[PDB]
RNA sequence: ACCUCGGAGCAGAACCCAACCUCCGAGCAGUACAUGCUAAGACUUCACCAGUCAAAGCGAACCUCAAUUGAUCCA
C-alpha cells in the first residue's frame, strides 16, 4: 500500500503515485512483478531493486502523440 | 595504377581501415566512422600495403 | 590414421582435427569459414560477416572427425568460464 | 465465495473494429513492395493532386483506394472566392482548405508522392507549404514492426 | 583446332522457388532471376541480384498488372513516351497475400 | 543434489561438509588427472533448499 | 501448345500498320493517366484487385435518409456566372492573382461547404470510418442536417466534434452542447454510441446518450431516456469510435422498451445495437445527422471505471504472433551458434543430474 | 595507468577534433573550387 | 591445341544436361568512405569447400557492373 508506506517519505510517496499510476490498483497498492528468471530468489531481487529504483528516482511514439495533441489544439481553439 | 592504403584514425583509438586510391593522387584524408569513439572522425593515410 | 600404435597398441588422434575443430558434447562439430583472414579488401561486408561466423558441420564430416579423434575429446568438460557451455547440450530437439 | 459483479465480465480479447486503429497505433502493415514501379504503395494515406486544364483537385486517399477527404476548385466553395481555378493561388487555397478538412477528419499524417517536375513546380510548393502550415505533416510515422 | 574456348559454366539453378498458392514465410526467396522476368508486387521485396523474397507470411499469388516506371528510370520513360496513345504496357507481378493479423488485443490486468 | 544427499542420509549435516564427505557419501566424483580442481556449488534447486 | 485469350487483349485495338502516323504519348503524365484507367478497368486475368480489394456485395447500398434538397439549376448557374463575372471584373483581384498575393476566406468556405457538398463529404468520411457497416449493416444515409456538437472545456473553450477528430474523456466528461437548424413542429432524437468499446460482446456497442422526442433545436427539453456516461476506452485497447446520431421524427414515438434506468451504471443494460433500434422504429423516423469523434484512454477513465462503474479497470496489451523458426535439426549444417540459441528456452545455466 | 593514458590520449584527440573537421572540410570545398576553376579553363 | 571464370545456342515452355561442339567475353574499372554493427527467414552451380539474397533491430542519413578470381600451412 503506497499511501500507508511510512518507510517512504511523503514528498516521494506522492511522486511515485503520479509516476506509477499504471501500477496502482483500486485498493491503492503498488504492484511489481518479475518473471525474467526461473529462480524466485532472483525474481524477488529484481522486484526489490525495482522498488529501490522507484524510491531513488522519486528522490531525484511520443512524436505521434505530440503532433496529434498539437492538432487537437488547432481545433479546440473554439473560443466562446 | 591503384594502391591499397592503410588509413589510421586521428582519434588515437588505433582504428585502421584499408581503401584504394590512384597512385598519382595525394595522401588521402577522409571522414570515416571510428567505432571506438562511436563517431565519424578524420583518417589520414599512413601506409601503402600493395598495388591493386 | 593409426588404429593400433606400436608402443601402446592404441588408436591415435589427428592433431590437425584437434587444432582446427571444436567438439560440443551433444555431438556437434564447430568450425570457422575458410578464407576469413584472406583478401578482405575484395570481400563485401555481408560476405565478411558470413566468413566471421562459427558454423556447424555435416553428419558425414561429424562422423569423420569423431573417427579421427579418440574418446578423450568427447568427454564432458566442466571448464570455469567456457563460452560454449550453453551449446554443450540440446534443448527442444525432436528427432 | 466473493460474488462477482455482472459488469466485470470482459472477454479475453478486445475486438476494436475501427479501420484506423492499428494505423494510429503504428502497428499496422504498410503495403511494402512494388519497388520496380511508381508510385509506392507503402503508406496508409496519401495526398494526390490532379491539375486538369481548368481545375485543381487534391484528395487524401487510403491505400485501399477509398477517399478520405477532398478539396477541388470544381466546388462553388472555392470557386466563389478565386479569380482563377488553375493558378498558383488555386493550388495554395486548395492546400489550405484540405488542410482544414484533414485536421477535422483526424488525418494528421500522409505521404505525398510527387513527380520531379511537380516537386520543382511552384504550385506544389505553395500547396505543401499550405498543408504544413495548416497542420498536416507530409511524412508518415514508421511502423513499429516489433 | 577448335578455336572456341570458354563456355563451360554450369546452370545457375534459377527460376521460381515458390509457385502459386504456396505458403511462404517472411524472408523466403520466391524467385531468382537474371533479368526482371517476374516483378516485385505486394509485400515482395527485391534483392540487389534482382531476387524476389517474401516480406510477409502468406500465400504467393501471381498476377498481371500495368507498368508505370519510376520517372527517373530514363530508359523506361523513354519507351513509355514513344509508346503510341491508348497503349498500356503490362508485366507479371508476384504478391504475398498476408495470412495472419498483425496482432491481437489481450487482457493483461484487471487493475 | 545436496538436498537429495542430505535427505537420503549420505551426507551428515551435523558435521562440516567438505570434499571428502561429498566423495565418501558418493555425491560427486572428482578426477584430479582430468584437471578437476574440486566442486563448484551451483544455484540449481535454491528455491527448495 | 497454346490457349487462346479468354477476352480482349490489352494493346489489341491499336493499329500496328501506321505506327508512325499514330499519335504517341510524349508525356509520362499522359501515359500515367491511361495506365491508371486500364488499371481500374475490370479485366479477365488475375489481378491485385482480385486478391487484395474489398469484395462487397453489389446489393446497391440502400438509402435510408431524408430526400435530397431541390434546387433550380438554371437560376443557380446564372447567379454563379454573374458572381464570377463580378469577381473577375474587380481589377485588384487580377492584380492579386498575378502577384500571387491573393487569399481565400476559410470560414466562409466552410460555411457554404457545410451547405453544399459537406453532406456528401461527411457521408464518404463515415463510410471510410466504417460507421454504416457497423451501425446500419451497410445502408447509407446522406447527413442532410449539419449537427454541430461541441464540448464545454475550460470556461471559454469548446472542443468541437466534427468527423473523426480526437476528443479525450477529460474533454468529454460532461454532456456536449448541440445545435441542429430546424423548424418548429419537427420532433427529433439524438443518440451517442461507442461502436468499438464493448468489453464482452464483439458485435455490440455501448449507448451513452438517448435524448428522445426533442422539441426542435432545443436540446434541453427532450426526454432523457439514457443519461450521458462519458466515453471509457480501456488502456491499451487503441482508438475507439463514438458517433452522435440525429434522427428526424415524424410522429411522437413511445420509447418504453428503450428506456435505460436513471443513474444507469450497468454495462449489461448499456449495451446497444442501433440496427435493432432503427429496425424496430424504422416506420417512425429517418436519420438526418452524424457527428463522430475518436477516443483513447486518459486518467479520467480510471475514474469512470473505478468510481462510476464500480469495477476494476480493464488493461489490454497488443501481443504479436510468435516467430516461425523451422523444425530443429540434429546437424544444422551451415548455421551459426545463434541457431541453438533460437531453440533455447532459458538463458540461465542448466546442470542436469549434477 | 595504461588504460588511463589511452583514454586521455583519445580525449586530447577528440578535444582537438571539431576544429580539424572544419578546416579539413574547408580544404575539401576549396578543392572543389580549384577543380571547377580548371574545368572552367 | 587445351586445362580457371562468365553470357548465348545445342537445351523452344520449372530445374538440370555432353563433344578436341558452335559463337562472344573475364583475370577490371569507376564511385564511396556507416563500402558501420547486428540479426529472422531463405537460395545454392547437382557432394564438400566455397558462393548468394535478406526483414526487424542498434547507429547514422533524411554502390554500378557479368565474369573481374586462389584454400590450408607458412611468412
Ligand atoms: Mg553453357
Ligand atoms: Mg555443366
Ligand atoms: Mg547444393
Ligand atoms: Mg533494414
Curated annotation (Swiss-Prot), chain B:
Keywords: Mitochondrion, Ribonucleoprotein, Ribosomal protein, Transit peptide. It comes from the Eukaryota. It is found in: Mitochondrion. GO terms for biological process: mitochondrial translation. GO terms for cellular component: mitochondrial inner membrane; mitochondrial large ribosomal subunit; mitochondrion. One of its GO terms (molecular function) is structural constituent of ribosome. Component of the mitochondrial large ribosomal subunit (mt-LSU). Mature mammalian 55S mitochondrial ribosomes consist of a small (28S) and a large (39S) subunit. The 28S small subunit contains a 12S ribosomal RNA (12S mt-rRNA) and 30 different proteins. The 39S large subunit contains a 16S rRNA (16S mt-rRNA), a copy of mitochondrial valine transfer RNA (mt-tRNA(Val)), which plays an integral structural role, and 52 different proteins. Belongs to the bacterial ribosomal protein bL33 family. This is Large ribosomal subunit protein bL33m. It comes from Homo sapiens (Human). The chain holds residues 14 to 65 of 65 of the full protein.
From Swiss-Prot, chain C:
It is found in: Mitochondrion. It comes from the Eukaryota. Keywords: Mitochondrion, Ribonucleoprotein, Ribosomal protein, Transit peptide. GO terms for molecular function: structural constituent of ribosome. GO terms for biological process: mitochondrial translation; translation. Its main location: mitochondrion. GO terms for cellular component: mitochondrial inner membrane; mitochondrial large ribosomal subunit; mitochondrial ribosome; mitochondrion. Belongs to the bacterial ribosomal protein bL35 family. Component of the mitochondrial large ribosomal subunit (mt-LSU). Mature mammalian 55S mitochondrial ribosomes consist of a small (28S) and a large (39S) subunit. The 28S small subunit contains a 12S ribosomal RNA (12S mt-rRNA) and 30 different proteins. The 39S large subunit contains a 16S rRNA (16S mt-rRNA), a copy of mitochondrial valine transfer RNA (mt-tRNA(Val)), which plays an integral structural role, and 52 different proteins. This is Large ribosomal subunit protein bL35m. The chain holds residues 94 to 188 of 188 of the full protein.
UniProtKB/Swiss-Prot annotation, chain E:
GO terms for biological process: mitochondrial translation; translation. One of its GO terms (molecular function) is RNA binding. It is found in: Mitochondrion. It comes from the Eukaryota. One of its GO terms (cellular component) is mitochondrion. Keywords: Mitochondrion, Ribonucleoprotein, Ribosomal protein, Transit peptide. Component of the mitochondrial large ribosomal subunit (mt-LSU). Mature mammalian 55S mitochondrial ribosomes consist of a small (28S) and a large (39S) subunit. The 28S small subunit contains a 12S ribosomal RNA (12S mt-rRNA) and 30 different proteins. The 39S large subunit contains a 16S rRNA (16S mt-rRNA), a copy of mitochondrial valine transfer RNA (mt-tRNA(Val)), which plays an integral structural role, and 52 different proteins. Belongs to the bacterial ribosomal protein bL27 family. This is Large ribosomal subunit protein bL27m. It comes from Homo sapiens (Human).
UniProtKB/Swiss-Prot annotation, chain F:
It is found in: Mitochondrion. Belongs to the universal ribosomal protein uL15 family. Component of the mitochondrial large ribosomal subunit (mt-LSU). Mature mammalian 55S mitochondrial ribosomes consist of a small (28S) and a large (39S) subunit. The 28S small subunit contains a 12S ribosomal RNA (12S mt-rRNA) and 30 different proteins. The 39S large subunit contains a 16S rRNA (16S mt-rRNA), a copy of mitochondrial valine transfer RNA (mt-tRNA(Val)), which plays an integral structural role, and 52 different proteins. This is Large ribosomal subunit protein uL15m.
